[PDB]
Design a protein around this ligand. Structure first.
Ligand code: POV
Lengths: 50, 50
């Protein structure tokens, strides 16, 4: 906003508030919110696993 | 291009050639190429499968 730079090549996510002030190009990468979880292990099937 | 319209609210996919001629907004829907395939039909091998 202060013209101390020319581009902003970075993980700068396009949102409502930033678009109202500065201008973005079209997205070079799209994404979202996802879930981390520990990969299953199978070292405990229960004691009546037979 | 002939100014016989004002907007183009439609499934008009942003590509290289169309962007060089007309101007698009930022995407309201993102997508890609995916695969149709028939859902697995269970494969019951009969009731006398033993
Ligand atoms: C482990 C140690 C050994 C113990 C056992 C030793 C004994 C041997 C025991 C059993 C032997 C069985 C023979 C094999 C049959 C093939 C199976 C089949 O595909 O047919 C079908 C079964 O229906 C039938 O079985 C029709 C067979 C015709 C008559 C055979 C028995 C004769 C009767 C007595 C005369 C005997 C002579 C006289 C005796 C005094 C199965 O169909 P499917 O393909 O699985 O799927 C369904 C198909 N569908 C969806 C289209 C409906």
């Amino acid at each position: 906003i202060d013209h101390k730079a020319d581009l902003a090549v970075a993980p700068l996510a396009i949102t409502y508030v930033r678009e109202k002030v500065i201008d973005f190009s079209k997205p070079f990468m799209t994404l979202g919110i996802s879930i981390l979880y520990r990969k299953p292990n199978g070292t405990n099937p229960g004691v009546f696993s037979f």
